Amino acid sequence: LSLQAREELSRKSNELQYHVVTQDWFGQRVDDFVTQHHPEWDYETVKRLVQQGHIYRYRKNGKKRYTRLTDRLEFDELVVVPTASFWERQLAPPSGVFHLSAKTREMAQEMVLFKNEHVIVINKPSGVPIMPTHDPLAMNITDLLPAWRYTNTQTPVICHNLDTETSGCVVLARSANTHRMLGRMFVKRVVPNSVYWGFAVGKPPVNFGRIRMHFEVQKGQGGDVIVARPTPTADSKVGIAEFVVNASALEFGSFISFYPLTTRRHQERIMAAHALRAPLLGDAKYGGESAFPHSLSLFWDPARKDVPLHLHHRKIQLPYKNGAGEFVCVTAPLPPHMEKTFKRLGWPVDA
């Protein structure tokens, strides 16, 4: 910050200095002064600069009075209010400075588990990605997004990028103002906020515990490991999950529940492929070479790529509550590919 205030001192810019004339503007609130002199910035674009410090200050005396939006002006000190004109530079100025046929605008409406005036929760199909990878070609969620604009909201914004092979429950924010709020809900939790289900093949060690691995993404796709119990401190971030083996196939599989306290890449599957070396069913990317599906009485024809990764983003506890005091918990029901192996095993698929 001490260097941010330096270049602010050593920048002529155009520094639109704005006098505060005796009559009209002395006394007015500053957010009135900026908004009726600078019509270019949206009001929210004016609050950010006025509070952030890339602010339109006011200068009366020998120091700069950074101010809140409601501070009123002084009795004609010709108290200049300086505003930024060429932010672009070392400053890095703040934010604000096909067609979807039917069978899609319908397909995207059976993938809705919960909607209110602030979010939309969907049920992603295992295998459809979110970000485009074949940049013109792949049918992903972001291209679908102008379908959940129910009630004409402005193109919901994706909040947490579920992966390709991961099925389950997603959250869009319906409002760029709500998206700022829904950040503190995802990154680096302390207590769980979501449940991942999965069918790892091979009963892991003790059916309760916590996994701390230290991932390192070497491009391309290096994906390193625990190497430092503390950390490599430079290129590594850790991913912590509190796994619980709900029920277990006697010694060859398990139905594990991961509560991923962190937000790391395939942290579900790479930590599952080394909680035991028993990876998830159909996880050809990290495990997946034990056999094609790891050689069971499941659908076993092509196998080599048949069995989809049995991983499901099951439940998300939203912070929006409900008519009864309870916070709302979406409960995205399992795809048939997990409803296959659950009933093939007779377990009570909890929806």
Binding site: I226, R229, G288, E289
Partner: protein, 300 residues
């Protein structure tokens, strides 16, 4: 969660290049019973011009016919090759690195600097034990890093994890042919259906588990050796009617050190105690002294 580097090797190439861009002589520790499964994918296009000292370990159990061609193949390319029984230990393999540079080294500009050696290979085929044998003894008898050998913290005694940066082992002194580490880039765990068989066949990745039962490699070492003879002589070594008709009898004929709870009138023996035997004995080069790979006579 103590796994290893996990990812396709063919994305660890453009980083391997810049690792060879500074190195001088490339090494490798392979298994002579697996001439090209224990190789990094780029061995073809890896360097083509740095003087490679490619070593095949455990050569005494690898067949000798396939040993000639694989020898003269690189020996034609110029890059050398050395085969060792490993009984006469790496101490003679080390002697090679004392000799296999004096003849091929470019003369050092500065009388005492190094011969920066880039080593590769699977850590479980002989590359680890080759480093940590020369890495441990350097702590006592000292050449460089110039400190009083006291700053090694509690419970390390060796550091092949979490630092492995500029870490290198000074194998020799006056022709100081030093050797790098190459943080393990091999056996990606994303291996092939068949490569895991030939890998666990050689004793490498000795893990036989739900991922790879004995009866899956034992079926492989039996069906690879369809020619019954000098292998049935291991069968005939245990009272077997020489030719085995298929997997059922031979594995069940060798249940003399196998078995489980079976009746006094009808014994239900254990075919997994016979599984590991037929599997682990072929590891020792006891059954037959025959390779696994196909040895492409063509360039590939």
């Amino acid at each position: 969660g103590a796994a290893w580097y996990l990812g396709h090797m063919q994305s660890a190439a453009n980083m391997l290049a810049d690792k060879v861009k500074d190195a001088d002589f490339i090494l490798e520790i392979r298994d002579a019973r697996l001439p090209f499964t224990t190789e990094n994918p780029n061995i073809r296009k890896l360097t083509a011009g740095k003087p490679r000292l490619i070593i095949f370990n455990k050569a005494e159990l690898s067949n000798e016919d396939s040993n000639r061609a694989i020898q003269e193949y690189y020996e034609r390319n110029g890059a050398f090759a050395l085969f060792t029984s490993a009984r006469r230990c790496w101490r003679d393999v080390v002697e090679a690195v004392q000799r296999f540079t004096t003849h091929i080294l470019p003369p050092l500009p500065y009388k005492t600097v190094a011969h920066v050696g880039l080593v590769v290979g699977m850590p479980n085929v002989g590359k680890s034990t080759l480093i940590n044998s020369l890495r441990l003894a350097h702590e006592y008898q000292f050449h460089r890093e110039d400190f009083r050998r006291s700053r090694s913290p509690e419970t390390v005694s060796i550091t092949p994890g979490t630092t492995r940066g500029m870490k290198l082992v000074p194998l020799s002194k006056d022709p100081p042919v030093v050797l790098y580490d190459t943080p393990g880039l091999t056996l990606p765990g994303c291996f092939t259906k068949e490569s895991g068989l030939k890998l666990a066949a050689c004793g490498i990745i000795p893990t036989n588990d739900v991922s790879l039962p004995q009866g899956m490699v034992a079926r492989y070492i039996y069906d690879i050796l369809v020619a019954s003879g000098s292998s049935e002589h291991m069968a005939e070594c245990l009272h077997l009617p020489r030719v085995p008709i298929s997997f059922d009898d031979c594995v069940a004929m060798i249940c003399e050190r196998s078995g489980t709870s079976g009746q006094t009138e009808m014994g239900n023996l254990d075919p997994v105690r016979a599984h590991r035997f037929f599997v682990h004995d072929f590891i020792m080069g006891n059954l037959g002294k025959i390779t696994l790979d196909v040895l492409p006579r063509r360039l590939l």
